[PDB]
Amino acid sequence: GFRKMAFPSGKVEGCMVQVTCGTTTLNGLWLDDTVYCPRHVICTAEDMLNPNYEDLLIRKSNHSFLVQAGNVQLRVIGHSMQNCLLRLKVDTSNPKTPKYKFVRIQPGQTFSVLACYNGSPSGVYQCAMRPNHTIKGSFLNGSCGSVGFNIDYDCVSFCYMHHMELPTGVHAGTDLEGKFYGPFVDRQTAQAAGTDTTITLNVLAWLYAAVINGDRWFLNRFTTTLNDFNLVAMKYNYEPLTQDHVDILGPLSAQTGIAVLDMCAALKELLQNGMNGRTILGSTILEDEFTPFDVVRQCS
């Protein structure tokens, strides 16, 4: 539609904690008797250069970690490493633990992020994982350990934890198994975001959203080949569209009676000629941070 929306953040707010090792404070996620946070919490200045994490961690005791849930200190009674995450066992299982899963999303998919500072929910926003495996977020002075999530009924699917700002100001992080999205690493290296593309699947979904809402002036009489579309789109720095993507857009295509390649033909014409001062869904640009599922969830 028109407004981009985040999921209501309440269920995730009740899981946010502050984790401190000496001089470093970040956010952790408290689910049952476990707190999850970036492993780099155990790290200092010089450590970030080339950290032997599994060495630095051998040093630490349970009493090293200060876990604060609002006004209560949670006793840490275990710690371990899973990839780029520290897992802290605490003596209290979170009475607000929602129904939840850990998922790994795909590039181009959207999720809500609750930005927190020192364990304290600060703001909520909706974003996409970019094709280049980074997020164009707003993570400021101490937001590491903030999570991305989707909510389907009363089940929270956690998908993202924030680890690092990249040289461009874009954000890099892991799933909830501690595996980075992207080639990125939790140390100070020369790593930079790759060049980014537009999420074609998502633009197409948003064009379906527009048509569903009666904004359809951009439709035309013609069709295109998949390959002929990709030939045009890639010149505009759009992600090649796959047959898998064509299939993903199936329900919206059946809802509107507009074949995906008929819609590609409309997009092709939009890219070559522009909007000509017009708007789609009150936008002067082609929007790419709404998935097919987002579109179905909201209007459709």
Ligand X SMILES: CN(C)c1ccc(C(=O)O)cc1
Give, as ranges, the residues between 33 and 72 that touch ligand X (CB under 6 A). none
Task: Identify which of 88, 79, 18, 19 has the alpha carbon closest to the alpha carbon of residue 54.
Answer: 79
Active site residue 40: yes
Task: Identify which of 57, 69, 64 has the alpha carbon closest to the alpha carbon of residue 21.
Answer: 64
Active site residue 142: yes
26 binds, among ligand X, a second copy, none (CB under 5 to 8 A by kind): ligand X
Q: Which of 62, 83, 272, 284 binds a second copy (CB under 8 A)?
A: 284
- Interface map 142-181 toward a second copy (x if CB under 8 A): ---------------------------x------------
Angle among Cα 182, 112, 118 to the nearest 5 degrees reads 85
User: Contact at 8 Å (CB) between 228 and 189?
Assistant: no
Selected range binding ligand X among 71-79, 140-148, 225-233, 270-278, rule: CB under 6 A = 140-148
**What separation in angstroms does the CA of 106 have from each of 43, 109, 129, 139?**
29, 6, 7, 21
Give, as ranges, the residues between 165 and 194 that touch ligand X (CB under 6 A). 165
Residue 144 binds ligand X (CB under 6 A): yes
**What is the CB neighbour count within 10 angstroms for residue 194?**
12
Selected range binding ligand X among 134-142, 184-192, 205-213, 243-251, rule: CB under 6 A = 134-142
Tokens of 169: 């100001």
Rounded to whole angstroms, the Cα distance separating 80 from 251 reads: 44
- Interface map 104-133 toward a second copy (x if CB under 8 A): ----------xx-----xxxxx-x------
Closer to ligand X by Cβ: residue 26 or 74: 26
DSSP string over 46-76: HHHHS--HHHHHHH--GGGEEEEETTEEEPE
Selected range binding a second copy among 7-15, 18-26, 33-41, 158-166, rule: CB under 8 A = 7-15
Active site residue 123: no
Residue 29 binds ligand X (CB under 6 A): no
Rounded to whole angstroms, the Cα distance separating 176 from 15 reads: 14
Site residues, ligand X (CB under 6 A): 26, 140-142, 144, 165
Residues acting as catalytic residues: 40, 142, 144
